[PDB]
Symmetry: D2
């Protein structure tokens, strides 16, 4: 099963406006830099982080322990104007996992309590022998159908419509959905089958007239899972699979 | 008149898979760093940049001339595994400006044409006497209603539902809408008035049960307009004004 | 006339140790990231920053005004766990200029005074019509004589021996010397001539058995001057010039 | 036994000037960003990296295996306009470890050969039971004596004289010396004793009238060693040790 870490900037709202408001262009840089660092440092141990709302983030951390989490927390404290709290939870589905993690976080106190800083806890347990399933979803021919033909903002609008439709659809399976740039989305989705995605894609195509494909990788860590998902997408592209979904499992054991 | 610059990574799609696919954690760090650098560099000249789709970005660039754009483009080439193209356009409304800018980019060639490297052009003209209006929009008490109450993913889904509702609504006015983190959004909106915002807001409250406020800053550059809009949010919070919208202008 | 800005991290020593000492990998990353941002941001206005001691940094800022300095200071304030002080001076020579700017800074108070935050002042005046001369200095064939032949640490020693020799020689002409990487050095050096450089290079060769070359650029900004120095170095390499120094000056027409 | 990794930007020289020379402010940002990333990424595994010459860096990597090295190399390739080669070696002294790693790197080819990309090798062995010793050297009262008294460049000058003097001294013991900012230096110094530094420190004071102190830390990784060296410096400052050197072990 899947281990997930929820990450929150401590008491961030008061900081951003106290003693005055702060240049937005600096806060964008500050926020992206945090995100970039978190992916390098969790990435160093085969994790993956999605940006979510920026002041709150979700990470798949199968195989990353409590001491490693503490050292990443300590690195942020030494180089940033703020601290971060982190709670870990495991569960059979991604949605179960983050819900438990968030519950324990909230038990410690408000996201705006100056006394509440650098929480670091495990809600139930760390995953000893589990797995992550990631589906890497992509639009067929975004460049010829949107990027090169309609405005920058209309492509962005259209991609945000598909994104929300996919979020509502996937939530029925306790699966999560995150934008990763371009026309690309990743869905932590332990428990879903290929036939589940083919259903969702039929509905998205009927509503929005957009064609979707996905590689599904299953592995021991987020890194392994997403690498296998990338190969699936190439297989589909090189027409060495019939359909718009492809599953690959890790077996280099 | 607002000036918009559209920014595109040249031939980005083929690079991410040639010779092979690349670890996604690396691609996230790369994309985020490019976004951060663009805000520092355009910010150094009082511009502002929205992440948009990460391989395509929209910036407000009133007051930033062609040679500065070129300098910024050179800096990315010297430091990244790829290049970027940029086209500038002016117009009365934000929507029109980026439309004009995209159209000229498209005349030069495809987003995935390896011989279309480093376009740098002006679709019509650079703004010499213009202004920027930015509305900075925020949800009331996100902490007490959602962040401290429901799961992380549930607050994320709800904020994204509000985001798309606001994108649809604002487009009738030829305004744009971008997420900037937590419960905040920014809307380049030359043409709109306080009453246009108050109208959109109670429709959103009726539908989603969330209450919004907004500071409207009007200035000569993205930075001035965004700075003023931030002050309007503080006036609403401090009860120095009695409605959920507040306009401040550079020469008040 | 050359314009120099001295930049100093306010009350830095106490911060690195309060409440405890901080992990050194984190301070190296923080310090390097600050120096990079100052080059991007001053660079965006055609300036150039040298890392100097990291908590104290020296920059050439001809053509960059007081408001722009303030905006850069503010950006650091919004994204880092400390603030920075800056003082600007202009003078006929680099050594004079930074000496004046340092003295004004010192009048405001101590490097470890917690109530001395975000100094920003000019010591005399901002250069109105002035110029920058930069010499870009480099060792002939580092790769064949040292990099590919001797240990990593042995090239590092020899490169540092030459660095100190140049520092001391150049000081007699009121010029500065900073290491920019590899086997490369930059010398702001308003007042010096090609012959002065050939005289220094002669002594260094005789003493260390290493051969030096330099392009000298003269321009209105640090970017103009240092781009021109770069071209000079390529001309020496391409034997378009018959000596180990080459001067190029800015001509917009 | 100390384990050292030498890191080199492949064929960097031709890249900086082809097809044209590149703006210097950009190259400074690029090189500093690379240095910073390398410390976060090796740091995430309890290593430490010193900038050295920027195109050539030296790292202490006790406990960091070959697979972790390969993945860091891959991260750089995915995000920079260039690639890096890395060779690892162990030995009793820092100086000999870096020497053996370099010779092996040189066996693969020139630092300016385009076909020699992303070398990754071990010269002898990865250290299983080793230790690192790091002395963290600092100048007593730089602020009152130099920073607040003389010009920016004058203090920079004196700190660089002390730096070269220490490099040459420490090399007699096969120890390395790196500037880390301010008035601070680190010396991987496996072998040396407190009295060894006390002799070096006497000579530097007699020649330059600069008074030095050092916390010395002995641990199983670079991170452990330098954290203990930091505690050492604080004991000296807190006057709860007698002299100007101070050792803590893990
Ligand atoms: N995060 C992320 N973005 C990607 C990845 N691969 C491609 N992209 C993005 O996808 C965009 C469009 O590229 P493609 O998907 O290859 O183009 P396409 O036009 O849709 O062609 P096909 O998808 O092959 O039908 C690029 O500009 C990138 O932004 C990836 O692995 N990760
Ligand atoms: N991008 C950006 N985000 C901000 C800014 N100010 C606040 N935020 C975000 O807003 C989040 C929530 O803080 P607040 O809006 O102050 O919290 P609230 O509970 O909604 O309080 P009120 O809006 O005053 O009722 C923070 O965690 C930040 O992520 C800003 O200026 N720019
Ligand atoms: N900071 C900086 N470093 C440079 C620049 N150009 C080259 N270098 C560095 O110089 C190092 C050695 O490259 P070269 O100078 O071409 O090598 P060389 O072997 O000395 O060859 P020649 O000088 O042509 O004889 C590279 O690895 C870079 O680190 C530059 O413009 N700025
Ligand atoms: N890299 C690095 N630099 C440090 C560290 N601690 C302090 N510094 C630097 O040292 C500079 C001067 O501060 P101190 O060394 O505490 O000041 P001092 O005036 O010499 O005081 P004493 O050392 O107590 O005699 C700071 O500005 C920092 O650059 C550290 O742990 N690592
Ligand atoms: Ca696609
Ligand atoms: Ca709010
Ligand atoms: Ca050379
Ligand atoms: Ca000291
Ligand atoms: K703001
Ligand atoms: K990928
Ligand atoms: K330290
Ligand atoms: K250069
Ligand atoms: Na794609
Ligand atoms: Na907010
Ligand atoms: Na060189
Ligand atoms: Na110090």
């Amino acid at each position: 099963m899947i281990q997930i870490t929820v990450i929150q900037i401590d008491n961030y709202g008061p900081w951003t406006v106290t003693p005055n408001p702060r240049r937005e262009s600096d806060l964008q840089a500050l926020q992206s830099r945090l995100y970039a660092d978190l992916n390098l440092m969790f990435g160093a141990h085969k994790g993956l982080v999605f940006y979510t709302r920026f002041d709150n983030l979700i990470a798949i951390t199968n195989g990353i322990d409590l001491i490693t989490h503490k050292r990443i927390q300590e690195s942020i404290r030494n180089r940033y104007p703020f601290t971060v709290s982190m709670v870990i939870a495991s569960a059979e589905t991604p949605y179960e996992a983050q819900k438990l993690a968030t519950e324990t976080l909230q038990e410690y106190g408000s996201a705006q309590d100056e006394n509440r800083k650098e929480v670091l806890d495990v809600a139930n347990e760390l995953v000893v022998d589990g797995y992550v399933q990631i589906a890497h979803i992509d639009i067929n021919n975004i460049t010829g159908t949107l990027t090169d033909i309609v405005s920058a903002y209309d492509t962005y609008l259209n991609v945000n419509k598909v994104k929300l439709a996919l979020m509502e659809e996937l939530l029925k399976y306790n699966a999560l959905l995150f934008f990763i740039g371009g026309d690309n989305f990743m869905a932590p989705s332990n428990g879903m089958s290929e036939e589940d995605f083919l259903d969702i894609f039929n509905r998205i195509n009927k509503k929005y007239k957009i064609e979707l494909k996905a590689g599904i990788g299953i592995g021991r860590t987020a890194e392994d899972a997403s690498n296998l998902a990338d190969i699936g997408l190439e297989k589909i592209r090189g027409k060495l699979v019939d359909k718009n979904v492809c599953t690959l499992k890790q077996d280099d054991f």
